[PDB]
Amino acid sequence: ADMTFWSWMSYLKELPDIDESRNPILKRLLSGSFLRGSTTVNVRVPARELVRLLSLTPEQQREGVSAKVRLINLLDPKYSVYEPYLYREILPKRSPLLLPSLGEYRGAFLTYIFHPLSKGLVGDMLETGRSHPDVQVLAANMVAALKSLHNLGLLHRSIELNSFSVLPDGTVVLGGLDTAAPIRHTVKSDVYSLGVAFRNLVQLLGGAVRQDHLELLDKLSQKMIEEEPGNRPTIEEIMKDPLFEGLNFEDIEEGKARPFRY
């Protein structure tokens, strides 16, 4: 649902405070020019005050956290609170294949979203050759993740390989949800974008990497990037592609896939 200026401003005020004097994020931002969309700050070793604010388990403490920060714009509050709004009001507390929030806060001039500190973005990881995943399972993980967003009535609208990230436990999740919007952009434009990401994946990978999986993914991606939306398969048709036969999609959707284990 699309709100009004006063709604967004009101919602901004409803976000809980964070204490910025007790917090190295501001210091890091002032020690450079980092602040642009959003800016990401990694906190590999959260301090006591941040551990308390987020109620981090010892496991979470060891994983680290990342903060997504945006400058509050008083002429357009939507830009700074849209993503917090999605996390608080629209997305389930834990959809298994979507990037989880650990908390949303407002300071004097910034909004904050905390995330688990990811092991990396999928595009970057494959590009550096750091990881050789099971192509079949990764592709299925990616389709499933998108489907889980469509089931909530949301398009992503900016899918790329780096939309996907690998959590410390090895779960691959869909992030970059600040561009998400209700179901011009349609389900078929998300199919196109995911197709382009698959093409990107095949170009990068031409351990668990199998040549027959790559050829099948290339064929699937060619269907997904058809110029005419009507000629592109639905998510349902994609899930019945030859590439995914023998896979239990229910397990993928529950978040049990680990495409980057050998």
Author numbering: 68 to 103, 106 to 252, 285 to 307, 317 to 372
Q: What text comes from the article?
A:
In the present work, we identify a specialized family of kinases that lack the glycine-rich loop that is critical for nucleotide-binding in canonical kinases, leading us to name them the With-No-Gly-loop, or WNG, family. These WNG kinases are conserved throughout the coccidian family of parasites to which Toxoplasma belongs and are secreted into the PV. Like WNG1, BPK1 is secreted into the lumen of the PV and is a clear member of the WNG family. As such, BPK1 shares both primary identity and predicted secondary structure with other WNG kinases throughout its sequence, indicating that its structure would provide faithful insight into the WNG kinase fold.
While we were unable to crystallize an active WNG kinase, we readily obtained crystals of the Toxoplasma pseudokinase BPK1 (bradyzoite pseudokinase 1). We solved the structure of BPK1 to 2.5-Å resolution. The BPK1 structure revealed a divergent kinase fold in which the Gly-loop and the first β-strand that stabilizes it (β1 in PKA nomenclature) have been replaced by a helical extension that packs against the top of the N-lobe of the kinase. Remarkably, not only do the WNG kinases lack a Gly-rich primary sequence, the structural elements that compose the motif have been replaced, resulting in a reorganized N-lobe architecture. The core of the kinase fold, however, is remarkably well conserved, supporting our phylogenetic data, which suggest the WNG family diverged from a canonical Ser/Thr kinase fold. Two salt bridges help stabilize the BPK1 N-lobe within the pseudoactive site, including the bridge between the conserved αC-helix Glu and VAIK-Lys. Notably, the lack of the Gly-loop and β1-strand creates an active site that is much more open than that of a canonical kinase, such as PKA. While BPK1 is a confirmed pseudokinase that cannot bind nucleotide, the other canonical motifs essential for catalysis have been conserved in other WNG family members, suggesting they may be active kinases. To better understand how the WNG kinase active site has adapted to bind nucleotide and catalyze phosphoryl transfer without a Gly-loop, we modeled the WNG1/ROP35 active site using the structure of BPK1 as a template. The rearrangement of the WNG active site has resulted in an unusually open active site that may better accommodate such folded or otherwise sterically restricted substrates.
